[PDB]
Design a protein around this nucleic acid. Structure first.
Ligand SMILES: Nc1ncnc2c1ncn2[C@@H]1O[C@H](COP(=O)(O)OP(=O)(O)NP(=O)(O)O)[C@@H](O)[C@H]1O
Lengths: 709, 148, 68
RNA sequence: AGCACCGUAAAGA
């Protein structure tokens, strides 16, 4: 089993500091700085931050779990400057793209030596500091680019975003791939299992790591409830953490007695001078309709309106004269004049950046935003209101999770300006003190990993000789997290000192999980030509590895069965839209033969893959796999590639625009990848075809610049 | 030619699902993307090293690629540009793995870990590249008392 | 209250849119003959790129412009 | 929470 030694240090109240180190190396604590400081700060650093800096000085990796808005980004800048002092290179992994652009703008303002990498652009890569997403770094680690041998400091933001299902593999794999001679920082939110994470990093790098945890916060919050029609906000918990359910009981009584509302709430808020306010509604039509309702009011002067017109024009002047004549632009601009804004992943990103900037200024007070602000921005406010607790994620129409409740509440509270922040929660249902308590005061949800094996992983790992998957699985978090749950039946057996479990769980104490899926993936790869006996690659593998933005087995089969070799330029774009697009729509479309026929061959190949998957028992279903690919935008993309107008396009489908933009950007990425694949096998007509399609897509707005850049 | 698929090289034909290729019996090493490799150096250019594989061009090891003594990794400066010679003499041998293949045909190769790099004294043989099975773990350590 | 913008915003790009010497022998003197090798000062010449009744009217407006 | 589907009672012409 993994031997590991964890320890605590004698410090003062304000935080908690604990180390995790190899089980056979004694502990000699950190040492004070030597010489000048890397970056002097105008103010005085908390114990939290100065401990982080003291750790970063002695060249030791760290974990930092503290609520947002606590200047958690200081350790990052210190590390960056320290690296730029020793000629080293440093890296900053931010999954989001817009957050990455913001961090790049900041680091560029400050240090003048930075470089951005992202799916859309690339800047000054010969920079001692590289800001970018994580998947880029994954591809690097695979292809051992010229960076891993130079960068000594990595810094991760939003590891808690690893708790998801579709992307929690990336951060893990990246960590497993980094070399022992690296150092790096983790900047998370509150998570109670930090000790396990640190032990994992240690046993994984044979390196010591530090952990800082604190509930500290500069702007304490006050939570209130609003029941339907109560016309009165009821306190529940106070700054001091004193939860008083007396008012909560009164609120429930009002609920029971009850048997154009959020408007009333915002009017209250503004009469209280509690502005500005954020509004978290877990949908899109609701946000938009609330904005429509509240258009009547005005929370700005006239000079502010002229100034907003100025900035808005200076921003959307980068577009054409026609994209200006777009219904969203017009039908929104007055809402911005009036001081209310809306933000959700269904807009054009131009207006999104515009609104985020305006909010950073203060030219809009009430903002209807669902979950974007919750994660990837530093733009706090004075008060926040939850339109309702319920939401949708994955499949379940679950209640709100304390983790997300707090991730959003952290928004409220502007340092300096606001002596405190006002959270409010709307309710229209009986909710006894248990659920309300575990929601409001309950602690965050732990950081469990997903670590679902994937094709790309297996193939890109078969390329290599020194690294094999079994290693990956035995080094992951999903495995290291199955050694503190082991003592249970092990303790039962120790008592027994039943024996069936003894034999089995003793031969399964330090063993591997999730192997059967690995063997089945291998079997598929063999049956389809993507590998061979002896577990070695085949041409198909070196064609699929180049693809990462979609299902690559089926793309390679489409190639090696001769589909794109007979079609035209755009039809390929459409058949790829059939993959990037993953949303449902109301009305399935009617498609012409020239454009539909190919999809039938696509579905035949899909059925073949499904049968080959079922033979090996991947617990897979056929109907889903086949229907997981929505062609609802084939005609959209066709007409777009014919060189048409975005307004002549947003109509054909009852879908928002931002989804189209995401579709098309992923599509262009996939086209670059397919060009490289054709470049690999040896064909040229196909790569010219795909490149021409790319040249057809990018016209006006799907690939505009980021105002933050 | 004239809507007719005409061979170009002597060997056996191979028909993958819809792709028709040929697998000659003697060729010079075409560059793959993960294949390990052994190479004898030929030149030392201001920026990089030029290496000789049984390839149709002069393989390339960028100064950025070669690992450094131990793990003392900060960045590459002019001092490294001048040690570019005193460490990797012209004529020496390197056991690397490919990094990428350029459109001009050349092969840029690197050193993923410390198991790779420069080689000791040992001995060497030069055979044809079409006589090594494409498989895994080219690095063997045999019971006879040696390694290959 | 507030009336004006901020600077961090006002920085973005979409928004902005020896010695001497006196030789009495050669103080107030100037060259009397100068060596040139250009046939333009020498001689007047039209504009190279031209056009006749239709080809590339852009060159026609260039003719109208530069030949006066 | 919502959108859709089905049935049910009532009013006018
Ligand atoms: N410890 C601190 N004391 C005072 N102001 C601080 C402190 N930490 C951060 N700030 C202020 O917070 C501003 C930006 O906050 P923000 O970027 O949201 O912090 P974060 O931890 O990175 N999230 C800075 O410009 C500072 O003025």
């Amino acid at each position: 089993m993994p031997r590991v030694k964890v320890q605590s240090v004698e410090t003062v109240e304000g935080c908690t500091h604990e180390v995790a180190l190899p089980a056979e190396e004694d502990y000699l604590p950190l040492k004070p700085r030597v010489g000048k400081a890397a970056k002097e700060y105008p103010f005085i650093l908390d114990a939290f931050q100065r401990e982080a800096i003291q750790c970063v000085d002695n060249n030791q990796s760290v974990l930092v779990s503290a609520h947002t808005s606590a200047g958690k980004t200081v350790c990052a800048e210190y590390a960056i400057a320290l690296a730029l002092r020793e000629k080293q290179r440093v890296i900053f992994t931010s999954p989001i793209k817009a957050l990455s652009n913001q961090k790049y703008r900041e680091m560029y303002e400050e240090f003048q030596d930075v470089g951005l990498m992202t799916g859309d652009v690339t800047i000054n890569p010969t920079a001692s500091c590289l800001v970018m997403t994580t998947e880029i770094l994954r591809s690097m680690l695979y292809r051992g680019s010229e960076v891993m041998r130079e960068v000594a400091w990595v810094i991760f933001d939003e590891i808690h975003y690893m708790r998801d299902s579709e992307r929690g593999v990336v951060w893990e794999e990246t960590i497993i791939l980094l070399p022992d001679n690296v150092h790096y920082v983790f900047l998370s939110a509150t998570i109670p299992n930090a000790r396990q994470f640190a032990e994992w990093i240690c046993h994984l790098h044979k390196q010591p790591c530090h952990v800082i945890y604190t509930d500290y916060r500069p702007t304490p919050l006050q939570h209130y409830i609003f029941p339907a029609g109560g016309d009165g906000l009821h306190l529940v918990v106070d700054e001091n953490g004193d939860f008083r359910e007396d008012n909560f009981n009164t609120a429930m009584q009002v609920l029971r007695d009850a048997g154009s509302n959020v408007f009333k709430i915002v009017k209250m808020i503004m009469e209280r001078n509690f502005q500005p306010v954020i509004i978290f509604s877990f949908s899109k039509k609701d946000c938009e309709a609330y904005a429509l309702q509240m258009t009547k009011l005005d929370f700005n002067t006239d000079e502010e309106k002229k100034m907003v017109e100025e900035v808005f024009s200076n921003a959307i002047d980068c577009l054409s004269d026609e994209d200006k004549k777009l219904p969203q632009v017009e039908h929104v601009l007055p809402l911005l004049k009036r001081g209310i804004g809306i933000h959700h992943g269904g807009l054009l990103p131009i207006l999104k950046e515009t609104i985020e900037i305006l909010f950073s200024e203060g030219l809009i007070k009430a903002l209807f935003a669902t979950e974007t602000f919750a994660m990837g921005i530093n733009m706090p406010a004075r008060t926040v209101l939850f339109t309702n607790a319920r939401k949708f994620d994955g499949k379940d129409f679950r209640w709100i999770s304390s983790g997300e409740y707090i991730q959003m509440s952290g928004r409220a509270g502007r340092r300096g300006m606001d002596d405190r922040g006002i959270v409010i929660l709307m309710v229209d249902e009986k909710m006894s003190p248990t659920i309300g308590k575990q929601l409001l005061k309950g602690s965050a949800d732990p950081l469990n990993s997903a670590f679902h094996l994937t094709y790309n992983m297996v193939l890109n790992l078969l390329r290599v000789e020194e690294i094999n998957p079994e290693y990956m699985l035995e080094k992951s978090f999903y495995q290291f997290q199955h050694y503190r749950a082991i003592p249970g039946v092990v303790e039962k057996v120790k008592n027994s000192e039943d024996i069936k479990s003894a034999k089995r769980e003793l031969k399964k104490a330090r063993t591997v999980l999730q192997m059967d899926e690995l063997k089945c993936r291998k079997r598929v790869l063999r049956r389809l030509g993507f590998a061979t006996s002896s577990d070695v690659i085949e041409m198909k593998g070196r064609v699929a590895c180049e693809i990462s933005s979609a299902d690559e087995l089926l793309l390679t089969e489409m190639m090696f069965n001769g589909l794109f070799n007979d079609l035209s330029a755009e039809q390929a774009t459409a058949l790829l839209s059939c993959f990037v697009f993953q949303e449902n729509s109301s009305e399935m479309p009617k498609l012409t033969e020239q454009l539909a026929g190919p999809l039938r061959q696509m579905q035949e190949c899909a059925k073949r893959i499904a049968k080959v998957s079922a033979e090996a028992k991947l617990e897979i279903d056929e109907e889903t796999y086949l229907s997981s690919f929505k062609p609802h935008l084939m005609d959209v993309v066709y007409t777009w590639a014919t060189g048409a107008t975005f307004a002549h396009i947003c109509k054909m489908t009852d879908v928002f625009e931002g989804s189209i933009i995401r579709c098309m950007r992923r599509l262009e990425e996939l086209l670059r990848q397919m060009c490289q694949a054709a470049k690999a096998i040896g064909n040229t007509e196909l790569e010219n075809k795909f490149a021409e399609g790319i040249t057809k897509i990018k016209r006006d707005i799907v690939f505009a610049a980021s105002l933050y850049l | 030619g004239e809507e007719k698929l005409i061979a170009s090289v002597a060997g056996s034909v191979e028909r993958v699902n819809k792709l028709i290729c040929v697998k000659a019996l003697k060729t010079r090493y075409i560059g793959e993307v993960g294949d390990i490799v052994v190479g004898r150096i030929t030149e030392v250019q201001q920026k990089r090293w030029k290496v000789e594989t049984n390839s149709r061009l002069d393989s390339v090891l960028l100064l950025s690629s070669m690992n450094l003594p131990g793990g003392e990794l900060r960045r590459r400066s002019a001092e490294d540009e001048l040690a570019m010679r005193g460490f990797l003499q012209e004529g020496d041998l390197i056991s690397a793995e490919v990094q990428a293949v350029f459109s001009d045909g050349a092969v840029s190769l690197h050193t993923r870990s410390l198991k790779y790099g420069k080689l000791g004294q040992g001995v060497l043989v030069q055979v044809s590249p079409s006589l090594v099975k494409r498989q895994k773990t080219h690095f063997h350590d045999l019971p006879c008392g040696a390694s290959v | 209250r507030k009336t004006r913008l901020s600077k961090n915003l006002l920085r973005m790009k979409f928004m902005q849119r020896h010695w001497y010497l006196d030789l009495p022998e050669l103080k107030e003197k100037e060259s009397f003959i100068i060596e040139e090798q250009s046939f333009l000062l020498c001689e007047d010449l039209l504009y190279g790129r031209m056009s006749f009744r239709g080809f590339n009217p852009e060159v026609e407006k260039l003719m109208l412009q530069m030949n006066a």
